[PDB]
């Protein structure tokens, strides 16, 4: 499995040897944003991150992925809204060609191993959940074309829970990444779930789980389960109204994502889930056996074995906390030894 760290491109990054020693296997450079003047062009917003620094990561054995989108941009004539630049293009085909060429250019120039979809704005639902049109169809085409041309690319999705949790919804918030996953699963290294900055969302049991309380793994386990299982139309004689999500993902394509605390307990993301709970979530997904080192009340419908690992937003917090997030999770996330 994997220990994944987000590296903000507006802060001095930790040394590659510090990250490798802590147990990091992958880092995610935040962020590429979207040109409003050449629709499809990706504008690098990581001034603190050099090709030399990325070489240092590779020399330490860490893979380096370019994260696209994010929450906002301050670069003039840029947006983090995908739809906005897709519709600004002369055609969806021109947009796709420009986006692919621009992404290939950045990958070649910086030596990236792949790219991450952290597109939090402007993945609007069109067509049907099972046969999406518009934004999801175009993004799926970009992902599947990039992977078809280079099956070594690490292509990841980093959804918010509303985007992937069992839902009747299909819009820019609800179920959009679940729809995208059915179109792209064959191309994806992993889907990393943002288990923070969210209200509760539904498990396939029709129970609404949120990140608090953080002393049980239920939320982490239920959200991973929502990606690993078909969404049922009926639960115990009742209609769910759930979209017809069919799971095509392997456990190795599931990553659970959290905010890392600094030494003071501060974080960029709320709430902070302690590493003891994260290990319980992985042990629970592995075994589907409840206990004080494994499942709480929520037990998934089967044992999955080892999932894909863990990420944190973001490594400058973890560094300040002597890399306790990576150090405490690496035996569990990487070697699958969680109790």
Residue numbers in the entry: 424 to 762
Q: What does the publication say?
A:
Among the L. pneumophila type II substrates, ChiA is an 81 kDa endochitinase with a novel amino acid sequence at its N-terminus and a putative glycosyl hydrolase 18 (GH18) domain at its C-terminus. ChiA is composed of four domains (N1, N2, N3 and CTD, from N- to C-terminus) which have structural homology to those associated with other chitinase enzymes.
We readily obtained crystals for ChiA-CTD and its structure was determined using iodide single isomorphous replacement with anomalous scattering (I-SIRAS) phasing. Each chain forms an anticipated GH18 α/β-fold and is composed of 11 β-strands and 13 α-helices. High concentrations of 2-methyl-2,4-pentanediol (MPD) were used as a precipitant during crystallization and we observed four MPD molecules in the final model; one bound to the catalytic Asp541 and Glu543 residues (MPD-1) and one within a hydrophobic pocket formed by the α5 helix and α5-α5′/β5-β6′ loops (MPD-2). The chitinase active sites of ChiNCTU2 and ChiA-CTD have high primary sequence identity and tertiary structure homology and modelling of chitotetraose binding indicates that chitin lines a negatively charged valley on the surface of ChiA-CTD.
